[PDB]
Each structure stands twice: as structure tokens, then as C-alpha cells.
Amino acid sequence: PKLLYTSANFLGIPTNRGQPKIGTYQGPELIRKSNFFQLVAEDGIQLTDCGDIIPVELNEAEDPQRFGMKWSRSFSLTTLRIAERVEELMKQSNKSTPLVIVGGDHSMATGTILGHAEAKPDLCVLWIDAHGDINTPLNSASGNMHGMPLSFLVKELQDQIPWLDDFEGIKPCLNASNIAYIGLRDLDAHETHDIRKHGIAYFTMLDVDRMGIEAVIKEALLAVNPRLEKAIHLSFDIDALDPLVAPSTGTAVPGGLTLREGLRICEEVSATGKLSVVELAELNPLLGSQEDVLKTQSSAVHILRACLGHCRSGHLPFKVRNLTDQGIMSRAAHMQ
Amino acid sequence: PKLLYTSANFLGIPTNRGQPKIGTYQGPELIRKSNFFQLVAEDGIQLTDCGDIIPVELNEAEDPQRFGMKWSRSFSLTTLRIAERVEELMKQSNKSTPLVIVGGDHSMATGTILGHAEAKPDLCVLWIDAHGDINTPLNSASGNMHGMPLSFLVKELQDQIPWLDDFEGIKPCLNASNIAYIGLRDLDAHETHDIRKHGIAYFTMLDVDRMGIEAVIKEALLAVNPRLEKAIHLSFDIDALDPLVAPSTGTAVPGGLTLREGLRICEEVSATGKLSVVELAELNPLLGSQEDVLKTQSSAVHILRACLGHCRSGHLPFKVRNLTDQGIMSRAAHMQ
Amino acid sequence: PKLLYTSANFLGIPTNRGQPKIGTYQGPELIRKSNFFQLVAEDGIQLTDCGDIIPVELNEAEDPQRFGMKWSRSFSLTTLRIAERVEELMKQSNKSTPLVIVGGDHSMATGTILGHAEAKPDLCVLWIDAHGDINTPLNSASGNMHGMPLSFLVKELQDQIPWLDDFEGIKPCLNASNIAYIGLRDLDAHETHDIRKHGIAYFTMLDVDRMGIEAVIKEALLAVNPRLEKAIHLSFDIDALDPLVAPSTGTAVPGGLTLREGLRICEEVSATGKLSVVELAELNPLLGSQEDVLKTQSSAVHILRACLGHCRSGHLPFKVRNLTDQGIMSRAAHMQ
Ligand SMILES: N=C(NO)NCC[C@H](N)C(=O)O
Ligand SMILES: N=C(NO)NCC[C@H](N)C(=O)O
Ligand SMILES: N=C(NO)NCC[C@H](N)C(=O)O
Ligand SMILES: [Mn+2]
Ligand SMILES: [Mn+2]
Ligand SMILES: [Mn+2]
Ligand SMILES: [Mn+2]
Ligand SMILES: [Mn+2]
Ligand SMILES: [Mn+2]
């Protein structure tokens, strides 16, 4: 059989300074420890583990609050380290070779999209999330960076981003028109304001309920990738899925996507042939029971396999086995 | 932004004599103890806690079985106390001001609808429930009052209600044509008989499966509130939701509404502008594990927020924050 | 009211040599121990417990591996014992009288279909399962018989079945065109190859997602039972349902049918009037927590009740109770 993607790269980013619950740094390990790699090879894909990006984690004294942001210099230093590594991987990829990134809290997305856009400036972004993650710093109630990662990247938002020297190299590489959200159900007011003002395509769980996921996917792809010309950066927050199916995550919100709805998003996005980067964020194996962690891990693996082209309707074998070749008598043969 | 309802009243009714499992009396506390009030205020709604109705709970000697009914004089005395309090609240409400009632087992509905109809005689009732709760007393296998509350209220059923002096003030204020059921999946035979005989609109989980919830809501509202002329009494039994999402309740039945389907019912009913009373019944925080109770509580809060107009697609902020007003340099400003 | 089936037979088959996890032999007991029998009688169906089939379980020395198969002589001996008993029951059934079989691992299906086809050679098979269970022996990675049961039965597969004397009486009684799958999401490559090559109708969770269960059922029935002329053998693997709703089973796969989707399959299949045999496979009450076992048991009972005609929209009573006959004064009567 033929594959859309025959090889793929894998990268861990154990960010944990974007939100205060310890454990998202164990995200990549949660996936490495799974049968993910084995299942992908069983499908005929050559998957290369490119290791982990080491985040910059400064101490309290070196990284005081600034404009309410917690760990903002850790954030900016990490953003640039991430961007550099992703850019480098995406350029040696130039059948494309998708990069699979396992986080880590969602604050990594500023860095991953930054680097990705360097290699492929024309990209679009599909943001699968219960949350907007597009708070500008003075509007954030939490001061957690994992709630702001897109705001630094969107050109139309720059008049609401306070200036900092160490953020200078974080160049806004996205237009509002290049992003589509699926799964929203917990926007902060100011996000709603920005999303509506600048016309960012979004499809909330309400849209998913009224339209159905099949149409929502079609609409999202239509909105930001009409003729499949652009590379896709698929940013998948695990908390988009329902807590019944992904409990081990920092900010669970009831009424989420079913696993199946999530698989459909990924299957469709994979099948475009334009999946350039997929990142899975906000796994925290330190949250919930042991069985919660397994449910979450399992959901992540199915989700990630779908992204690489796994087909729930089955895969043909590489060589068809035949009974005679082993010198073995078949029942049909025997009946003579 | 504008709201359909800018204020709202909140009332607890800790009924527990309608069914034998202790704990539904802790229902209202389960919700007060939650972030419900905070979330509602965050949406710009002024919510007034009107306290709890104290139920009449007689002892065994004072309240023997009568026609098989358990605690029927506690029921009738409580029905009148409830009716009086609700009538009083709904008249000082005369942008309507919705009343949110947290139970308590479902037997409270005889009282709440009675009083509600006093203030607004022309109402319709949307009954969201896995059960009919319309057993007449000699047909009830359990003798539990929470399985009979509508039978006393429906005019066409009065020839099957045995007469009791203390029930005289429970005047049948509903026509069969004023009620619509959504969510049914466990009707007793005699309920099925009555529901079909007198032509009560009903939509079972089977209808929900074949029609989809969007159409079922439209049909229900069409059946009992064609042009949105009537006040709506929305009686929401928590056990309508699936046990996976509301386990802490006395008579759980598998195959229920998803949380999302429930939210859609409430969102639609809210958006009519006719939500006059909403009541949530059969929470029992004494049932199930600690995590079961949290799941149930959480579902109740999302459900109740939807009823008051909460929007999963987001809310605009009351004042838009701007970076310059604080004397702060934006990144866009800096780039000159 | 009228019933499609007024009586029914019940048979346990505690197979456990088709897969290595101990406990599927407790399947039938799990259902007998439930309120299943009571609920069915409450619907007006006369259900006769025909006891259990005793499987042949040979020791290691007597049953070595052959062509990789584990316990293949236990399998063949059991297949014939099952076939004989089912044939006998289905002939004394000649309003049909459905046979309800509770397993037991799925390897029993070779025997049950064999015997069923003896009594009703013209049957079709609806296979509800996350798995294909149609591996030929040299293609099986596990060597577990519960993954092969259909391969011995399908005429087009016989050139890939190795001959064994003790399998001679296992006569291939099915054509590829007589089988339809619903629920697939974990086919082995060689199954996919066979299913596509010989044109077996199949509807995976992907089809269920895109088409919706209502259409998938219609298509399946169209594919193998166009004008409802054929008896239906409904082979229901509990692991077709989602692990959230049937956790206690040996090979759980995420992203399954909802309980409701499963009920719809059964309701539709029941309503054809052609439900001849229904079998439920792969219950293992030795797996999972106590609450997992209850969830699974409960799902099985609802599923099996649906198969026998249970209606979620309610059942009429056998005799309508009337208030006057007991010499009792109604409220309506009193108001004169
Ligand atoms: N887990 C997430 N987003 O994906 N949290 C964001 C929460 C909130 N919007 C904030 O700024 O903190
Ligand atoms: N929880 C409920 N209804 O909402 N129980 C009612 C059970 C049954 N119909 C009865 O009369 O007791
Ligand atoms: N539980 C099941 N099928 O229903 N297991 C089959 C697993 C696999 N296809 C095999 O041959 O072992
Ligand atoms: Mn996020
Ligand atoms: Mn999120
Ligand atoms: Mn109720
Ligand atoms: Mn109920
Ligand atoms: Mn099976
Ligand atoms: Mn299976």
C-alpha cells in the first residue's frame, strides 16, 4: 500500500513554566513509554526520535513578574531555543516529513510556530483546544504563559502586547486570517473580543453540536487553507478532548470532543497531505489516578497515530502470506 | 453586551421524603458550595440567593401509608408550603427574572409548578428526565412520591387520583397538551399508557437517537410553546444525563443525554426569553465516590449556567482594556 | 400489546480457551446474576434458561500448538459440541423463538454459527465487533482462537486454512457475501486484505462517524439481508462498545460505539422479525474494578433486552388498572 507520509520526526518539549501544576514536563516520556513508536512502525512509517528540547528554567530572582506574566524570561529564552530547533528540523525536511511534537504545556506553541514559520512562512494554524490561548499579557487573569502563546504571534494584536527587550526576537509571523479554532468552550472575555474583532475563524463546542464535526472540519480547512496550498501547523491541546477520555491535564473542561471527533479532525488534517507539524500539549501524568493517566496516554496515542495517517478502516499488509509457500496442505487442497 | 436576563433568583428545596435514599437534601448545598454563583456574576447576572424552603417532614405515626403512598401527608403539606413560596417569588418578579430552584428529589415539582402556575397560569412545562414521574398512586410500584409529581397536576388524570382531604388544595393546573418530555428511557407501563392516551408530547432517547437533539428541541418547543407566547417551567432531572456524567443520583439509567445534549436543551430554552422557572432535581451527594460527586456537581453547574444564558461561544467584556491608558509602551508603538 | 417474539431461549457458553485471560467463563453467570430475566418477563416474554454448554478443555499434553494455534483441539471438539446443541435448539424452534447465547470468548462463534446454519442454511451474519475475528491460522500473530472464528466458516477462505483431521466436521457454511461488520477499529492487516478482496460488507467506526449509525445499520441490513428474507445471526462482541461503557473485557479498544449506538443496532435488528440467534461475547467479570464489572454487566443487559424487543419509548400494560374497581373514590368523582 501507499502512504502519504513514509517517515516522520518526533520531538519532546517538556515545558512546565507556562502553568503552575508540576508534571507537564513528563508528557513526552508518557508517550515514549507507550506503544506509540511500535504501532507507527507497524504501519510502515519510519519514525525518528530527535530527543527533547531542554527548556530554559530561570530561578525566582532572575525571572520576576513583568506585566503580570509568570516566568516570562524563561518563556522568551525557551521560545527562541524551541524556534531554533524546530526551524532546523523543518529545513532538513525540505512526500513531506511531518514533525510530531509532544509537550509540555501549551506555552511551547509560541516557539514551535515561530520556528515552523521560519521554514515555511506561508503556513496556517489549526488550534484544537477548549481554550483560546490568545490572551494578551495585561488581560490575563492568571499570568500563566500557557494562556497567551498565540498573542505574541498575531500581527493584529501587537498594539496590546507590552514591549520587552528579551521578546524582540519573537517576531509576529501570523495573520488573524491564518488561524482556525476547533473545540472552544472556555474563552475569557477579552479573547472573545479579540477573536471576533479581528475575524479569527473559530468553531466552539456549540458549533460542533449544531453543525456536526464533519462540517466543522470542512469549514475550518476552508477558512484558512482553501485549496490545500499551505503547510498546516496542527496545535492539539489534549484538554480539547472530554475529561472522560483525557482526565490527566491541568485545566479540564466538561463537554469536550469525543475521542472519535478528535480522531476525525486528525484524520482529515492528515489526509490533506499538508500536515507539516503536529503538536500535542498539556499532558500531565502527575494528575489524576493511575487509570486516568492510562486513559489520557491512550487517547494521545490514538490521536497521534491518526495524524500520521493511521486508518481505522485498516491497512493492507506489505507482503501477502500464502499457505503453499511453506509446504502446507490447505483444506481446499485436501478436498480432492 | 446585552443579556436576556440580567438578574435571577435562587432557591433551595431539600426534599428527601419523595424517595428513600438519604442525601437529596444536600443537593442545594452541593451547588452553593460550587463556583456557580461566582461564574454567573462573572457573566453580568445579578443572582439573589433566596435561601431554602423548609420541607414538612412528619414522623411515621403521623404519616402512615395511604393508597400505597409513602409520606403522602409530608408531601401534601410540603407541596403547599413550596407553592406558596414560589408564587410569592414569581409575583414580585412581575426582562423577566428567572427563578432557579435546586432540589431535592423530584417530588418538589408538584409544589413548584403549582405555585408557578398561580403566578403565570398560562405556562408550559418541559420535563427533562429519564422517567415519567406521572404515575397515579394506585399504579405506582414503589409508592415513592418522586415518581408521581405530575399526576396530581394534570387535569386529564384526575379520575385516577384517589381523593384525600389534605390534597384538596393541590389543584390540577396543567393540561396534557402543556407538557413535553425530553430524555425518557425508563417509563413504567401505566405511564406509557397515560402519556399515549392523553397525547402528551414526548421525546425518548430513541427519538433523540433518530432525530438528533437539535430537532427534538425544536419539536418539543413547537408542541407546547408554538410562538413562544407562554412562560416556560423547565423541570430538569439530573438523571436525564448519562450516569458517566451524573453518577450521583438515586435512580441512574444508562444511555442518557450527553452533557452537550443537555446544554443544548438549556441553551435553546434560555434563548427563547421565556425561561420563567428552572429546577434541577435528584442530586444526591451522598451517592457514589468523591469524584462521582464532583462530576455530578460540575454537570449541574454547567447545566444551570446555560439556563441563565451562558454562552459556550464566549462573552464580550464589559469594558475593553487598552494598553496606553496605563502609560505602557506596546510592541507596535515601540517599532518607530 | 403485541410482541414480535413472545418466547425465547437462553444458553450459556463459558468458553475461555480462545484467549488467554481467565474469566470469560464467568460471562453467563454475570448475566444470570443480573435482573435480566426479571426485566424480560416484565415485558411479557417467556424466557427459558436452557443451561450451559460444557466446553471441552484438554490439557497441555493433549493439545499442543498446531500451526501456531493455541488449544485448537479443545476448539474443534468444543465447536462440534456447541454446533450440535445449537442445531438441536434451533430445530425445536421450528413468531419465531430467538436463542440468546451468553459467552464466553468469541471463539464460540464457529460452533454457534455452524449449528445455526444447520437449522437455517440460508442465514446472514451481523458481526458487531471492534475486531475482524477472521484471521486464518498462519496469519494470526497471537495464535488465540477467538481471533479466527469466522475464517473456518467462510468458503472463500478455505485455501488459506491448513487442513486438520479434527477440523473436518467444521464445514464452511458461509459465503463472504452473507456477512456484514459493524464497529471495526482494530483490523489486522491480513484481515483487511481478506475483507476487501472477497468483498465482505464492513462498516468501521470511521463509517459510523461519517454516515451516522442510522444509515450504517440500514446499509448493513441492505448488504446481507435486502428484503428481510434471511434469518439473522447477530454476533455481538461486548468490546464493540466503548471501554467507558464496557471496560470488563479482554481486548478493549478506545473510540467505540456508544451504548445508544449499540442499542440502535439491536433495536433495528430485533424489529426485522428475523432475529434468530443473538450471542454476546467476551464479557470478563474478572477484569477491572467492581464498578467496571457493573457497568459492563448493565450494558450487556440493556443490549440483550433490546435484542428481544425492549422499547425505550415504553410498553403498554397488559391490563389497565381502574380506580373504581377497588371501590375507591377519585378526585374527579369527589368534585360533585
Ligand atoms: N490550559 C489552558 N489553555 O489551553 N489554560 C488557559 C486558561 C486561561 N485562558 C488563561 O489565560 O490562564
Ligand atoms: N427518579 C425517578 N424519576 O425521575 N424515579 C421514578 C421511578 C419510578 N417511575 C417510580 O414511580 O418510582
Ligand atoms: N477480542 C478480539 N476480537 O474480538 N481479539 C482478536 C485480536 C486479534 N485480531 C487476534 O487475532 O488475536
Ligand atoms: Mn492550550
Ligand atoms: Mn486548553
Ligand atoms: Mn424525576
Ligand atoms: Mn428521573
Ligand atoms: Mn470478537
Ligand atoms: Mn472484539
Short mmCIF file of all heavy atoms in Angstrom, two decimals, chain B residues 13 22 38 57 77 90-92 107 134 159 172 174 186 227 260 282 294 298 304:
data_model
loop_
_atom_site.label_atom_id
_atom_site.label_comp_id
_atom_site.label_asym_id
_atom_site.label_seq_id
_atom_site.Cartn_x
_atom_site.Cartn_y
_atom_site.Cartn_z
N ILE B 13 -34.60 23.66 47.69
CA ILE B 13 -35.69 22.86 48.24
C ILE B 13 -35.16 21.46 48.55
O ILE B 13 -35.13 20.60 47.66
CB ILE B 13 -36.87 22.75 47.28
CG1 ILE B 13 -37.33 24.14 46.80
CG2 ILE B 13 -38.00 21.95 47.91
CD1 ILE B 13 -38.58 24.10 45.94
N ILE B 22 -31.24 8.57 51.41
CA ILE B 22 -30.93 9.81 52.09
C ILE B 22 -29.83 10.57 51.31
O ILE B 22 -28.91 9.97 50.75
CB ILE B 22 -30.51 9.55 53.54
CG1 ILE B 22 -30.14 10.85 54.25
CG2 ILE B 22 -29.38 8.55 53.58
CD1 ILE B 22 -31.34 11.61 54.80
N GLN B 38 -20.27 32.51 41.50
CA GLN B 38 -19.18 33.33 41.01
C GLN B 38 -19.22 33.42 39.49
O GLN B 38 -19.11 34.51 38.93
CB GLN B 38 -17.85 32.79 41.49
CG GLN B 38 -16.65 33.49 40.92
CD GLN B 38 -15.38 32.68 41.11
OE1 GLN B 38 -15.39 31.62 41.76
NE2 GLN B 38 -14.27 33.18 40.55
N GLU B 57 -41.47 17.44 57.29
CA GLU B 57 -41.17 16.02 57.45
C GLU B 57 -41.82 15.43 58.72
O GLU B 57 -41.29 15.55 59.83
CB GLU B 57 -39.66 15.81 57.47
CG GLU B 57 -39.01 16.18 56.15
CD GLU B 57 -37.50 15.99 56.15
OE1 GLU B 57 -36.91 15.70 57.21
OE2 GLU B 57 -36.89 16.13 55.07
N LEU B 77 -48.31 18.62 52.59
CA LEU B 77 -48.01 19.80 53.40
C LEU B 77 -46.84 20.55 52.79
O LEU B 77 -46.83 21.79 52.77
CB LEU B 77 -47.70 19.40 54.84
CG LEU B 77 -48.96 19.00 55.62
CD1 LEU B 77 -48.61 18.40 56.97
CD2 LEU B 77 -49.89 20.20 55.77
N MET B 90 -42.43 34.56 42.26
CA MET B 90 -42.79 34.82 40.88
C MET B 90 -43.70 36.05 40.70
O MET B 90 -43.90 36.52 39.57
CB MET B 90 -43.48 33.59 40.28
CG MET B 90 -42.61 32.32 40.26
SD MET B 90 -41.18 32.63 39.22
CE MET B 90 -42.07 33.09 37.74
N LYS B 91 -44.27 36.57 41.78
CA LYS B 91 -45.17 37.72 41.64
C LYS B 91 -44.41 39.01 41.85
O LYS B 91 -44.69 40.03 41.21
CB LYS B 91 -46.36 37.62 42.60
CG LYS B 91 -47.43 36.67 42.08
CD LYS B 91 -48.62 36.51 43.02
CE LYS B 91 -49.66 35.59 42.38
NZ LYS B 91 -51.02 35.68 42.98
N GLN B 92 -43.41 38.97 42.72
CA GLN B 92 -42.51 40.09 42.86
C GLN B 92 -41.55 40.19 41.66
O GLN B 92 -40.84 41.18 41.52
CB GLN B 92 -41.75 39.98 44.18
CG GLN B 92 -42.73 39.91 45.36
CD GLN B 92 -42.05 39.72 46.72
OE1 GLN B 92 -40.85 39.43 46.80
NE2 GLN B 92 -42.83 39.86 47.79
N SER B 107 -40.13 15.16 43.78
CA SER B 107 -41.48 15.32 44.32
C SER B 107 -41.81 16.80 44.57
O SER B 107 -42.97 17.17 44.65
CB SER B 107 -41.66 14.52 45.60
OG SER B 107 -40.90 15.08 46.66
N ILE B 134 -45.16 10.52 36.45
CA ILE B 134 -46.56 10.83 36.20
C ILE B 134 -47.43 9.62 36.55
O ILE B 134 -48.58 9.54 36.16
CB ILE B 134 -46.77 11.29 34.72
CG1 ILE B 134 -48.05 12.13 34.58
CG2 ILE B 134 -46.70 10.13 33.74
CD1 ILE B 134 -48.34 12.53 33.14
N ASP B 159 -59.46 11.41 37.31
CA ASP B 159 -60.31 10.26 37.60
C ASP B 159 -59.49 9.04 38.06
O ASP B 159 -60.08 8.04 38.45
CB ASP B 159 -61.15 9.88 36.38
CG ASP B 159 -60.30 9.36 35.23
OD1 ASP B 159 -59.15 9.83 35.05
OD2 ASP B 159 -60.80 8.48 34.49
N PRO B 172 -55.26 20.77 40.14
CA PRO B 172 -54.72 20.41 38.82
C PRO B 172 -54.68 21.62 37.90
O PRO B 172 -55.73 22.06 37.43
CB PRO B 172 -55.71 19.37 38.30
CG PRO B 172 -56.33 18.80 39.52
CD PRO B 172 -56.39 19.91 40.53
N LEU B 174 -52.59 21.88 35.07
CA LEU B 174 -51.99 21.60 33.77
C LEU B 174 -52.91 20.80 32.87
O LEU B 174 -53.65 19.93 33.35
CB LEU B 174 -50.67 20.83 33.90
CG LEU B 174 -49.46 21.49 34.56
CD1 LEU B 174 -48.30 20.50 34.61
CD2 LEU B 174 -49.08 22.79 33.84
N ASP B 186 -37.11 5.05 30.63
CA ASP B 186 -37.50 4.11 31.70
C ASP B 186 -38.92 4.40 32.17
O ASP B 186 -39.17 4.62 33.35
CB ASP B 186 -36.51 4.19 32.88
CG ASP B 186 -36.54 2.95 33.78
OD1 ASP B 186 -37.01 1.89 33.33
OD2 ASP B 186 -36.07 3.01 34.94
N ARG B 227 -45.51 29.74 19.50
CA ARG B 227 -45.00 31.06 19.11
C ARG B 227 -44.28 31.75 20.26
O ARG B 227 -44.19 32.97 20.29
CB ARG B 227 -46.13 31.96 18.60
CG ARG B 227 -46.85 31.42 17.36
CD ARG B 227 -48.37 31.61 17.45
NE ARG B 227 -49.01 30.32 17.27
CZ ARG B 227 -50.03 29.86 17.99
NH1 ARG B 227 -50.56 30.61 18.95
NH2 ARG B 227 -50.51 28.66 17.74
N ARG B 260 -23.40 17.69 26.61
CA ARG B 260 -23.62 18.60 25.50
C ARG B 260 -25.09 18.64 25.06
O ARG B 260 -25.63 19.72 24.82
CB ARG B 260 -22.72 18.23 24.31
CG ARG B 260 -21.27 18.70 24.45
CD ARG B 260 -20.32 17.80 23.67
NE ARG B 260 -20.55 17.88 22.22
CZ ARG B 260 -19.89 17.16 21.31
NH1 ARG B 260 -18.92 16.33 21.68
NH2 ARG B 260 -20.16 17.30 20.03
N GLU B 282 -32.94 15.80 41.97
CA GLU B 282 -32.39 14.48 42.22
C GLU B 282 -30.87 14.41 42.34
O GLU B 282 -30.30 13.33 42.22
CB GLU B 282 -32.87 13.49 41.14
CG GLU B 282 -34.40 13.23 41.13
CD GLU B 282 -34.92 12.48 42.36
OE1 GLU B 282 -34.10 11.92 43.13
OE2 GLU B 282 -36.15 12.42 42.56
N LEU B 294 -18.18 15.14 42.36
CA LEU B 294 -17.64 16.30 41.63
C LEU B 294 -18.12 16.34 40.19
O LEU B 294 -18.37 17.43 39.66
CB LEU B 294 -16.12 16.33 41.63
CG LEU B 294 -15.47 16.40 43.01
CD1 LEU B 294 -13.97 16.28 42.82
CD2 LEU B 294 -15.82 17.70 43.72
N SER B 298 -20.37 19.39 38.87
CA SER B 298 -19.87 20.11 37.71
C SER B 298 -20.91 20.16 36.59
O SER B 298 -21.12 21.19 35.96
CB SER B 298 -18.56 19.47 37.23
OG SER B 298 -18.33 19.75 35.87
N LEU B 304 -26.94 24.57 34.80
CA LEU B 304 -27.61 25.75 35.33
C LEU B 304 -27.07 27.03 34.71
O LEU B 304 -27.84 27.96 34.48
CB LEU B 304 -27.50 25.81 36.86
CG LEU B 304 -28.33 24.74 37.59
CD1 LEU B 304 -28.11 24.78 39.08
CD2 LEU B 304 -29.82 24.91 37.28
#
